[PDB]
């Protein structure tokens, strides 16, 4: 009576993850990227509810490897010092067991070990190494251009619209773009620079609150500005200035949010409590200079909810040129420094904060900052987006004639 | 021109078919040769994907047609539902959540009836 009927142009997505190309408008973007598109290009959807998660996205790793493809072709260090951890002369470790006498005197004496299940030596063994590499060095300029990440053929990038978007949860006002908004490659520990802000109000996140080990991202609505310059009498000295009473209002509404939602406690701010010094300082690259600026006096807002240069707050800042790679593990040396003076006016847009939850008398919570991940600094600009795969084939049982 | 395949999602299926009809009726240096060929590469890739799904419909006797009447009857265990609920109470999401193992089997039976 009525049978199978084939339809083309069928609105059903999937969630496959693919390579997604670039960009908007002479080394990388010439070779890797496309020109712009005449935006606007949006399709508003109606009664859909697409489930968004930010912390399980797979636009992050593609973009992270893509900026690895940027900065080993645009800002080449003179020398790269990377690990080389290998399992000399042989593959003597074999499948498993114990004994095996390698290492001690130089790298070729005997060190017959004992195991019989395995767990690792120097689980299974690795004798590590250090590949040192020298790369060229033209004094190359740098500027993070906006990168409109455009979806390939037969794919879509879904996008939320509500301004209180917590990353997780479902979004109802789901739109569809063909290509993303303005995204700039700005690596910055300790602080977010040149990011896109929020329309309605500030937002506080985590991958997991109460776990006190995931980088709490705070994204602002007030475009706070920052000014690092290099004046003199010294060659490698610089400083930043930030507007006080913009910073008091910003910290006030941040602690207002954190007190109206998650505690219910007392606040206390502090500095990064140690480790490798690219997290203790606000680190950012600007014009070919790797500014490491001290970030103690910004963080003091010990505030019941109810002597440090109170108007022109100065951040003493060193220029260092033997840097730890965020790209992989290891260090890198660049060209010798610059002679002139560099302007680095930028937008403070967010914060990478952590916790140290406890302890029963307190009562307070020590709310030291963190950062150091650069993938976390992409989850704030890969903010709405979800890669979905269309399939336009459908099957419906109609009459048909 | 394949962007607007999904503008009627969330709505029901006959309104989506009418929207398909409406949307189908509605539509000197090295920098030159670098920013010129990738446009043509995207055009050729879109054309080849479209032609790929065109012959994928053409193996079933459905080449070019958005809506085509094929020749495979039911199995009555393929969503034994009244036509009113079929076209007014369920979107596409419920149904390609519902019959995927069955749509593989319908792919096989449409190929077998297409050769004979």
């Amino acid at each position, epitope marked *: 009576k009525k049978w199978v009927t084939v339809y083309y142009g069928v609105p059903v997505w*999937k969630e496959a993850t693919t390579t997604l190309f670039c960009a908007s408008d002479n080394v990388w973007a010439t070779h890797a990227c496309v020109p712009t598109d005449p935006n606007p290009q949006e399709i508003v959807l109606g009664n859909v509810t697409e489930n968004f*998660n930010m*912390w399980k996205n797979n636009m992050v790793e593609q973009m992270h490897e893509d900026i690895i493809s940027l900065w080993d072709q645009s800002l080449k260090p003179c020398v790269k010092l990377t690990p080389l951890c290998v399992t000399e002369k042989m593959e003597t470790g074999e499948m498993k067991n114990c004994s095996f006498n390698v290492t001690t005197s130089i790298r070729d004496k005997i060190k017959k070990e004992y195991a019989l299940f395995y767990k690792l030596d120097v689980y299974r063994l690795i004798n590590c190494n250090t590949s040192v590499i020298t790369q060229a060095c033209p004094k190359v300029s740098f500027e993070p251009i906006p990168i409109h990440y455009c979806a390939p053929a037969g794919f879509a990038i879904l996008k939320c619209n509500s301004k209180t978007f917590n990353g*997780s949860g*479902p979004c109802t006002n789901v739109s569809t773009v063909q290509c993303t908004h303005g995204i700039r490659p700005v690596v910055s520990t300790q602080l977010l620079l040149n990011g896109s802000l929020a329309e309605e109000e500030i937002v506080i996140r985590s991958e997991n609150i*109460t776990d006190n080990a995931k980088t709490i991202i705070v994204q602002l609505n007030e475009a706070v500005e920052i000014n690092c310059t290099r004046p003199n009498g010294n060659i490698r000295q610089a400083h930043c200035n930030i507007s006080k009473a913009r910073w008091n209002e910003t910290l006030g509404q941040i602690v207002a949010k954190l007190e109206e939602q998650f*505690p219910n406690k007392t606040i206390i701010f502090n500095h990064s409590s140690g480790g490798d010094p690219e997290i203790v300082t606000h680190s950012f690259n600007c014009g070919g200079e790797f500014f490491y600026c001290n970030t103690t006096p910004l963080f003091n807002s010990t505030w019941n909810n109810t002597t440090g240069g109170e108007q022109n707050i100065t951040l003493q800042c060193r220029i260092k040129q033997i840097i730890n790679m965020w790209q992989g593990v290891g260090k890198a040396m660049y060209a010798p420094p610059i002679r002139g003076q560099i302007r680095c006016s930028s937008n403070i847009t967010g914060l990478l904060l952590t916790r140290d939850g406890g302890r029963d008398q307190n009562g307070t919570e020590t709310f030291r900052p963190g950062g150091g991940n650069m993938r976390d600094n992409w989850r704030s600009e890969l903010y709405k987006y979800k890669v979905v795969k269309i399939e336009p084939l459908g099957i419906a049982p109609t009459a048909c004639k | 021109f394949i962007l607007g395949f999904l503008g009627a999602a969330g709505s029901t299926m006959g309104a989506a078919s009418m929207a398909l009809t409406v949307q189908a009726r509605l539509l000197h240096m090295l920098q030159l040769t670098v920013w010129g060929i990738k446009q043509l590469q995207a055009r050729v890739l879109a054309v080849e994907r479209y032609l790929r799904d065109q012959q994928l419909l053409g193996i079933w006797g459905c080449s070019g047609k958005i809506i085509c009447c094929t020749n495979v009857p039911w199995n009555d*265990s393929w969503s*034994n539902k009244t036509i009113n609920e079929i076209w007014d109470n369920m979107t596409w999401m419920q149904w390609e959540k519902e*019959i995927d193992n069955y749509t593989q089997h319908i792919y096989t039976l449409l190929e077998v009836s297409q050769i004979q």
Partner: antibody
Amino acid sequence: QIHLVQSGTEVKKPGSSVTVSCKAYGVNTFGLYAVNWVRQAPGQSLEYIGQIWRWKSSASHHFRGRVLISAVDLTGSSPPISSLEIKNLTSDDTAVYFCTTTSTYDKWSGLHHDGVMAFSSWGQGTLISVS
Amino acid sequence: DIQMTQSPSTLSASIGDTVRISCRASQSITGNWVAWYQQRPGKAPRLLIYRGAALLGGVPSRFSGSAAGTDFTLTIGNLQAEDFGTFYCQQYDTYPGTFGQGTKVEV
């Protein structure tokens, strides 16, 4: 992992109310996860009660008005906690109660059909009897 | 609703049985919106099988099942000492579904 744990085991006088508490460790939030509620008479088959699918609390239609559900997102020092409000304690509501969770994440899982779901993990149940 | 009926309601089985349990439906469930649950006495009735023919990762690879329109078949393969459980079959097609009756296996 999900190590869903409820509150203690009580016993009740008739004609009262009770809020059963189910804590939810290992849960992101109730946007990607939905809380369904089951009861069990001591010696019968299991029995559906309710849902918090996409923050829309609803019990079933044979069981309206008496027992209705609330849910609390993770806050600061608190994991996500679903609570169950039971009115008009009769003599035959004596049962072991269960809270469940499911994954709402992808549409094409098969663990959910428009709020009609299979139940992924399970608590430990609380017995309520009548003196 | 749509009434389910598990059968047989009680059997006994030696160690290493292929126990085949049917679960009847009043309507004809197309799309296979049925799940299989196991409950041992006192603990949590964990899920075994969703969508009729899909095995959960935490459940071992010894359980299976199939569909017969109104019937659904649960199959134990190589019954071990730990799977002596009262079984259940949920229909989760329409709102709200109900479960089976039980199969309390013995020896």
